[PDB]
Enzyme design. Structure first.
Site, PDB file in Angstrom:
ATOM      1  N   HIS A  89       0.833  -1.212   0.066  1.00 30.35           N
ATOM      2  CA  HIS A  89      -0.257  -0.207   0.174  1.00 30.35           C
ATOM      3  C   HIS A  89       1.262   0.637  -0.162  1.00 30.35           C
ATOM      4  CE1 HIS A  89      -2.967  -2.734   1.086  1.00 30.35           C
ATOM      5  NE2 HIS A  89      -2.757  -3.013   1.934  1.00 30.35           N
ATOM      6  N   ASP A  92      -0.918   8.838  -1.733  1.00 34.98           N
ATOM      7  CA  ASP A  92      -1.392   9.727  -2.920  1.00 34.98           C
ATOM      8  C   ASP A  92      -2.429  10.319  -2.195  1.00 34.98           C
ATOM      9  OD1 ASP A  92      -1.703  11.767  -4.489  1.00 34.98           O
ATOM     10  OD2 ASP A  92      -1.978  10.596  -6.221  1.00 34.98           O
ATOM     11  N   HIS A  94      -4.069  14.235  -3.017  1.00 28.79           N
ATOM     12  CA  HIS A  94      -4.110  15.744  -3.964  1.00 28.79           C
ATOM     13  C   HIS A  94      -3.840  17.110  -3.776  1.00 28.79           C
ATOM     14  CE1 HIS A  94      -7.067  13.239  -6.672  1.00 28.79           C
ATOM     15  NE2 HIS A  94      -6.237  12.097  -6.222  1.00 28.79           N
ATOM     16  N   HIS A 129      -6.023   8.721  -1.299  1.00 29.33           N
ATOM     17  CA  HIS A 129      -6.264   7.036  -1.548  1.00 29.33           C
ATOM     18  C   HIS A 129      -5.091   6.791  -1.530  1.00 29.33           C
ATOM     19  CE1 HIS A 129      -5.165   8.276  -6.011  1.00 29.33           C
ATOM     20  NE2 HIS A 129      -6.044   8.620  -6.203  1.00 29.33           N
ATOM     21  N   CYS A 130      -4.886   5.400  -1.944  1.00 31.20           N
ATOM     22  CA  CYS A 130      -4.182   4.636  -2.131  1.00 31.20           C
ATOM     23  C   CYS A 130      -3.875   4.503  -3.623  1.00 31.20           C
ATOM     24  CB  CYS A 130      -4.577   3.143  -1.545  1.00 31.20           C
ATOM     25  SG  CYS A 130      -3.042   2.103  -2.009  1.00 31.20           S
ATOM     26  N   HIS A 139      -7.666  -0.710  -5.720  1.00 32.25           N
ATOM     27  CA  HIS A 139      -6.758  -0.271  -3.728  1.00 32.25           C
ATOM     28  C   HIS A 139      -8.174   0.850  -4.141  1.00 32.25           C
ATOM     29  CE1 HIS A 139      -2.785  -2.614  -2.818  1.00 32.25           C
ATOM     30  NE2 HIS A 139      -3.699  -2.939  -3.264  1.00 32.25           N
ATOM     31  N   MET A 144     -10.300   2.100  -0.109  1.00 28.87           N
ATOM     32  CA  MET A 144      -8.755   2.781   0.149  1.00 28.87           C
ATOM     33  C   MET A 144      -8.652   4.191   0.135  1.00 28.87           C
ATOM     34  SD  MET A 144      -5.123   0.659   0.861  1.00 28.87           S
ATOM     35  CE  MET A 144      -4.423   1.161   2.086  1.00 28.87           C
ATOM     36  N   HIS A 249     -28.077  15.429  -2.530  1.00 26.59           N
ATOM     37  CA  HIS A 249     -29.221  16.324  -2.648  1.00 26.59           C
ATOM     38  C   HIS A 249     -29.764  16.294  -1.723  1.00 26.59           C
ATOM     39  CE1 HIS A 249     -32.937  18.046  -4.271  1.00 26.59           C
ATOM     40  NE2 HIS A 249     -33.182  17.016  -3.645  1.00 26.59           N
ATOM     41  N   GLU A 273     -29.337  22.897  -5.921  1.00 27.37           N
ATOM     42  CA  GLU A 273     -31.113  21.744  -5.275  1.00 27.37           C
ATOM     43  C   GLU A 273     -29.658  20.460  -5.432  1.00 27.37           C
ATOM     44  OE1 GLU A 273     -33.767  21.060  -8.736  1.00 27.37           O
ATOM     45  OE2 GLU A 273     -32.383  22.538  -9.770  1.00 27.37           O
ATOM     46  N   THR A 274     -28.826  20.876  -6.053  1.00 26.41           N
ATOM     47  CA  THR A 274     -27.816  19.557  -6.736  1.00 26.41           C
ATOM     48  C   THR A 274     -26.123  19.979  -6.785  1.00 26.41           C
ATOM     49  OG1 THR A 274     -30.120  18.243  -6.950  1.00 26.41           O
ATOM     50  CG2 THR A 274     -27.698  17.031  -7.825  1.00 26.41           C
ATOM     51  N   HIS A 300     -28.080  12.174  -6.602  1.00 27.85           N
ATOM     52  CA  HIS A 300     -29.699  11.650  -7.399  1.00 27.85           C
ATOM     53  C   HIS A 300     -29.090  11.604  -8.984  1.00 27.85           C
ATOM     54  CE1 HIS A 300     -33.257  13.953  -8.192  1.00 27.85           C
ATOM     55  NE2 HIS A 300     -33.871  14.608  -7.007  1.00 27.85           N
TER      56      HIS A 300
HETATM   57 CU   LIG Z   1      -3.608   0.012  -1.094  1.00 26.67          CU
HETATM   58 CU   LIG Z   2     -34.881  14.365  -6.024  1.00 24.65          CU
HETATM   59 CU   LIG Z   3      -6.019  10.409  -7.722  1.00 27.31          CU
END
Ligand SMILES: [Cu+2]
Ligand SMILES: [Cu+2]
Ligand SMILES: [Cu+2]
Ligand SMILES: [Cu+2]
Ligand SMILES: [Cu+2]
Ligand SMILES: [Cu+2]
Lengths: 333, 333, 333
Positions: A89, A92, A94, A129-130, A139, A144, A249, A273-274, A300
């Site tokens: 494992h 990373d 961001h 994430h891995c 993964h 993960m 939503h 709304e969304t 949604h």
């Molecule tokens: Cu992993």
């Molecule tokens: Cu709706």
């Molecule tokens: Cu990424």
């Protein structure tokens, strides 16, 4: 300034959807913030049918815990892969700059650990994430992943530049799983991860998740585990999806202020709304509750929500406001 | 102020893509605006092949009609489920606050009616749809959705805050249908909705629509039913998708001012070629026509548009401008 | 002013991911900019397995070349369909106004050519693609698409209105292919395009690409063909997808300034981890590199990236900054 001269703070992480204690407005200068995560590979039941997968987790949960720091803090992560695990494992972020987000520097075999430090130069919510080379989507789609929030040092501001303060914060991680299916459509079962791999890849290549869940399982954020609030409370919901687009939503509400792509130097979108959170992104939405009762918080695409699992509940207490909504004539013949 | 002291106005709705008469700039104080809708379950032919589904509609159309009010009006909806229908229905407005958008208060069996009132506190275009518990995506994907527009009391403004006035308005509802298919790929046929249900659910779980149409059918907005305009006219197109993402594009034009997520307190995006409207959202785009001829308005997943149905036409009259575009050398050997 | 009185400049296009020389800030008044493209239908190997498709290209490449002009220039395109081709082609510019983006005026049979002129009235990056009536998605998804950038006459500006200047520019075209598969899941092979057509349509209707690639093939932007930069360089990456949504992400970096929907009169989104470019759109992201090493630039649906092909690399040279990221404790037992 030399990093060794900065204060250090150790944080102990909590299980989603809850978030470790922190201050919105930075009460200290820049700090090194120390986090520890333990990788756990475990069996998980992900649906009402009792479908069970070999999940790969940060700290025992899907998603991994929300980490919270301030802009220009240093994040120092101790990542431990115990000998009871089978796979390699890494991590990373961001939020970080360089070396594939830390992934090139954090490769740990079972029985090994590593410590990474990076400067959190950009304010926002970010996925982590891995990402082990040759095997990234497996993964990530085995659970993960999590998120990190880097708050502006003076906290959140509205579209005009005035303070926005939240009373509660929740972290919803949305996970797409791709459980392999035979010609008849039943979920296949596998003895080891290496025997699972090609069928995992084939299932992924359909681009059709078998399950899309909040907090690791169908119904994980319902019933006794429903999110809660009171009328008049300002709630921030942080929502991540490491792999696949989603469109949160709040049924019965709105996103009053939304960072759909999660980055706080941009003004928020109002009255949504969304909102669309792209795969590989974390977003944040702020809402002030104005009515009590049960709310559903859903992806949604309503198929994704009500058939594949991407639905949770808020139970909200307080006064009913008949000005905002009322039944004039109740259902009758 | 007491709601009984407010003026009341009754609106009679029109069939999409047309929109009931209204004022952009509010000519009265806040009002109670009264709407009536009748649920109709009916057979509908949705494609050139003559594929026929049991559609569930508000007021006999897919989509349901566009309702138009102003910010801080009260919407009062009388919803009638006649005894000739078989199923339970309700309505959820994304524009409303509380009680699952009204859905918890509007459950009507065949032979029953109900009246809901809510205050339209946020300006924007918003989806409404049916949402009966345990069965939401089936109703929504059988056509039971529309939209409501809550105009700012002083009408629409550009990114700078100056007035934008439309000469015409059209409402495009985009519907994803999921007609169940056998192992050979033919569309299955069913005697009753209850016998359809599980196969409907299975078809939905593929996340692959069989049909994606404007105004209820392949080619509904073409030919004699093409939308129209003249060069120099300012047209607002309101576009909703209750379940699935879409990406409208006017072939040969642009969105001059676009609210991709549909909420009018945000400044519009300018000069869009294509814009993303997330599932569960309504958006609005304003364009001034500068050239005559035929325009296609499409979902710019071109497979969705030209094979699955998500394409309509504008026929535009007026003067050709050779400055903007000309054929210098016509196709020749 | 009469168009014949304007200066004319001929541009010779280059193969993506590189971009023809131009000025960011317009060094002349409005011009007629002359481009020539030759249609080439050719066999292309698109993956490591040696899967070979009959590609349809502008100028021999997938994507077609990036054209660059300034706001209110005239684009004059000579499009040549040589007699060695079999199919009818045309071109639709999303940048242009009228006649289906030029598509109604540019229909060329093999052995024919045509010249179209249009005024580039809106600043932004825009898709262009082939759009022959009755057959649009097939041509587009066989590779027949590219992009055009219409720069503001005073170049790019940040969210505050100050100049942003790029040192390098790259053009990433992302292509979804839909290679027909039998019941066993193998890729079918076809003798002529007309014999391919229905199976092409059936494959498209699944809405599940078999391949999603940068610059026409799995691994086209890796190894010897990796993109390059140095620490401190400002890089603009223009990214188009004519048919299907994508979500670019620079692994180890960010989009410092992003036009996700690609239109330069809007302020950029800041500090993006990942951004959504809708199908039928081109976007642009500006990043200043702060660390050396290998970066992967991916569609952050990680299945699309690492299994279906939507991944390339940057090789970045310069000084490692231990302030921004460091290994505190290297992986160990
Ligand atoms: Cu992993
Ligand atoms: Cu709706
Ligand atoms: Cu990424
Ligand atoms: Cu219904
Ligand atoms: Cu073509
Ligand atoms: Cu197009």
């Amino acid at each position: 300034v030399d990093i060794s001269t900065l204060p250090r703070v150790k944080v102990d992480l909590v299980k989603p959807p809850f978030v470790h204690a922190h201050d919105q407005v930075a009460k200290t200068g820049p700090r090194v913030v120390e986090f520890t995560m333990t990788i756990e590979e475990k069996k998980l039941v992900i649906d009402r049918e009792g479908t069970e997968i070999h999940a790969m987790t940060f700290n025992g949960s899907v998603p991994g815990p929300l980490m919270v720091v301030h802009e220009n803090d240093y994040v120092e992560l101790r990542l431990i892969n115990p000998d009871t695990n089978t796979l390699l494992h890494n991590i990373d972020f961001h939020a970080a700059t360089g070396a594939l987000g830390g992934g090139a520097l954090t490769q740990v075999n079972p029985g090994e650990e590593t410590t990474l430090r990076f400067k959190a130069t950009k304010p926002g919510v970010f996925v982590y994430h891995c990402a082990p080379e040759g095997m990234v989507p497996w993964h990530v789609t085995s659970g993960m992943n999590g998120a990190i929030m880097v708050l502006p040092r003076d906290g959140l501001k509205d579209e005009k530049g005035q303070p926005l303060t939240y009373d509660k914060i929740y972290y919803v991680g949305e996970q797409d799983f791709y459980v392999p299916k035979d010609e008849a459509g039943n979920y296949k079962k596998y003895e080891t991860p290496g025997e699972a791999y090609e069928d995992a890849v084939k299932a992924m290549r359909t681009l059709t998740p078998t399950h899309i869940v909040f907090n690791g399982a169908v119904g994980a954020l319902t019933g006794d585990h429903a999110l809660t609030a009171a009328v008049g409370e300002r709630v921030l919901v942080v929502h991540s999806q490491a792999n696949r687009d989603t469109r949160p939503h709040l049924i019965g509400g709105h996103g009053d202020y939304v960072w759909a792509t999660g980055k706080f130097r941009n003004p928020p979108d109002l009255d949504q709304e969304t909102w669309l959170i792209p795969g590989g992104t974390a977003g944040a939405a702020f809402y002030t509750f104005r009515q009590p009762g049960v709310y559903a918080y859903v992806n949604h695409n309503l198929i994704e929500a009500f058939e594949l699992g991407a639905a949770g509940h808020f139970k909200v207490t307080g006064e009913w406001n008949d000005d905002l909504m009322t039944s004039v004539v109740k259902p009758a013949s």
